Design a protein around this ligand. Structure first.
Ligand SMILES: Nc1nc2c(ncn2[C@@H]2O[C@H](COP(=O)(O)OP(=O)(O)O)[C@@H](O)[C@H]2O)c(=O)[nH]1
Length: 598
């Protein structure tokens, strides 16, 4: 027999994940029928008969005969939750809905979702949400998409088609063929796009029918229920009045019972305890449920969202496995299974790599997997605040490869000891609370650090520079000449030889100064005071308003154009072209040879 597919909801903030979950629940509850729907902790069921009923208006186009008993929707949406809905080597979710706001299209978290989905090989569909916000939309509440779209004005349907294509485009670009669900023949070959309104209920019938069809067709083996002790995962650890520290878990195989011995992953190792109570929300029909109310149950079966009361759960961490054990002997075996699972996620090595700290097992796993996907070695991965030890581990890495010698801290504090050491060691600590942002911030830094290293090689050379002596800013006429200039292109640095617009040598830059400070460099648009050491006498060899150039050696011009061409500014290249031409007209020997060479 089959059990319920477990469905998770992803997508960018405010694209409507929460509204969509709530609308699905309400629609199910309204569609039921006679007796209420079985209530779960952190999750809502849509039974088989309710889906078939909701699907009835589709009878002609998309029929639905169900062999799954229903769908379990996880009621906490988003990507941290999804990452904590985990088991060894994969997800506990069986299907995802990726919500995209049809009016906005893909946003940064939409790409995060796609990565998380391929990484853990979770199948999905796209819910193109907020269709009711299309200008001129005339809602038909709760109606199938296929019916309401035919009751819109031609311009409204045009916009919808345009906005769906925006999604289609991004998907093909990402390597994932996707189409409006109506146009798909082979649902193995193409991801379904279902336009919906979490607000009006439009398209909810096809959403559910497509979910049901895709899960029952392709996931039969994964969905098979085997009788035996519970396997599950902990999503949340918290206080509950009258029960102490409880865990909220999803059971994905077997049966969990009151009095069962459980083994659950904790900060200090596998915890062995015994279930005192299994809590579920009270039935909604019950008159005492106006009060937010819980009832104890004897048992729950996969798939279930359940709250577990048992002593000693304080040290549990989100994303930990939880197993029922039939005997002490079985619990001892399960302790080793748990510890081996936890060691894959929390580890330390002598490898040259980044230091990863996070707050839950799920996000720690997803962070490590994202780095691995990109080829970034990971020295250690663990739970909790960034400590002095973490910084010193990244310092070991830093000495070998500075681009890897960092701490990536996901939603954890950094201790003052660690702040102090990072400063002394030159180790950067990255702090963020969204995974893609942590990763992007690190990658961006790496790009800029690598660019800085190339620029060192370029600054071995006298670079192209062009600047005008400002009328009214001659501070000193000679020995050294000191003049206000505007940089018209390229760059000037202390030590650069300079020449006039005819290529005659005037001297060399002794100093470049702001109104505030001495500068190592000045670039396009800078107005600075340049001290020039040499024979230069202002009024004689150059005048106010005259344009001066750096005297780039021929060999240096060659290397800029053949090794650093992509790195210098367009304006820097413009100036080198001016310089090469000044040199050409002067009949400069070495420039003539380098230009022929080029
Ligand atoms: N007009 C319209 N608004 C929506 C729809 N779905 C969500 N919203 C609104 O968009 C906002 C964000 O929704 P929410 O479910 O919190 O997005 P989440 O951050 O992805 O969980 C809220 O104001 C919702 O009422 C929809 O289909 N149509």
């Amino acid at each position: 027999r089959l059990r319920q597919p477990i469905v998770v909801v992803l997508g960018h903030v405010d694209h409507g994940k929460t509204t969509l979950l709530d609308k699905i629940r309400r629609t199910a509850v309204a569609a039921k029928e006679a007796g209420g729907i079985t209530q779960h902790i952190g999750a809502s069921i849509v039974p088989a008969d309710v889906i078939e009923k909701i699907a009835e208006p589709l009878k002609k186009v998309i029929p639905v005969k169900l062999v799954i008993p229903g769908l379990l929707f996880i009621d906490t949406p988003g990507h941290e939750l999804f990452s904590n809905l985990r088991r060894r080597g994969g997800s506990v979710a069986d299907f995802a809905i990726l919500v995209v706001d049809i009016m906005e299209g893909f946003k940064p978290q939409t790409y995060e979702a796609l990565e998380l989905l391929k990484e853990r090989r979770v199948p999905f569909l796209i819910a193109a949400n907020k269709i009711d916000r299309i200008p001129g939309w005339k809602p038909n509440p709760d109606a199938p998409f296929i019916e309401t779209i035919r009751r819109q004005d031609p311009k409204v349907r045009e916009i919808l088609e345009q906005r769906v294509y925006e999604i289609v485009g991004k998907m093909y670009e990402a390597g994932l063929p996707a189409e409006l669900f109506t146009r798909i023949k082979d649902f193995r070959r193409k991801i379904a796009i279902v336009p919906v309104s979490a607000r009006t209920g439009e398209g909810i019938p096809e959403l559910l029918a497509v979910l049901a069809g895709l899960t029952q067709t392709y996931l039969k083996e994964r969905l098979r229920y085997a009788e035996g002790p519970a396997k599950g995962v902990v999503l949340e650890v918290k206080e509950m009045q009258g029960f102490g520290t409880v865990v909220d878990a999803v059971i994905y195989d077997g049966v969990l019972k009151k009095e069962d011995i459980i083994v659950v992953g904790g900060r200090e190792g596998p915890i062995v305890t015994r279930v005192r109570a299994l809590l579920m929300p009270a039935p909604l029909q019950d008159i005492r449920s106006r009060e937010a109310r819980f009832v104890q149950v004897d048992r729950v079966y996969a798939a279930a969202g359940v709250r577990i009361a048992a002593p000693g759960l304080d040290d549990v961490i989100a994303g930990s496995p939880i197993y029922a054990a039939e005997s002490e002997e079985e619990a001892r075996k399960l302790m080793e299974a748990v510890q081996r699972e936890i060691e894959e996620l929390r580890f330390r090595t002598e490898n040259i790599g980044v230091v990863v700290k996070a707050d839950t097992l799920g996000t720690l796993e997803a962070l490590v997997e994202a780095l691995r996907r990109r080829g970034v070695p990971v020295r250690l991965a663990d739970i909790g605040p960034v400590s002095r030890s973490d910084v010193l581990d990244a310092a070991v890495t830093r000495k070998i490869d500075p681009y890897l010698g960092v701490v990536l801290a996901f939603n954890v504090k950094v201790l003052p000891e660690a702040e102090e050491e990072a400063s002394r060691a030159g180790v950067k600590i990255f702090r963020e609370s969204m995974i893609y942002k942590l990763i992007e911030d690190y990658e961006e830094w790496v790009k800029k650090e690598k660019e800085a290293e190339r620029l060192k090689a370029l600054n071995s050379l006298i670079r192209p520079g062009k600047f005008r002596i400002l009328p009214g800013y001659v501070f000193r006429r000679s020995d050294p000449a000191i003049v206000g200039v505007e940089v018209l292109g390229g760059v000037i640095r202390p030590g650069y030889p300079v020449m006039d617009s005819q290529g005659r040598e005037l001297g060399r830059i002794m100093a470049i100064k702001d109104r505030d400070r001495s500068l190592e460099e000045a670039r396009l648009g800078a107005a600075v005071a340049v001290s020039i050491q040499g024979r230069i006498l202002i009024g004689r060899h150059a005048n106010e308003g005259d344009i001066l150039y750096t005297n780039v050696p021929a060999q240096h011009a060659y290397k800029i154009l053949t090794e650093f061409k992509d790195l210098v500014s367009k304006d820097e290249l413009d100036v080198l072209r001016e310089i090469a031409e000044i040199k050409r007209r002067a009949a400069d020997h070495e420039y003539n040879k380098v230009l022929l060479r080029l």
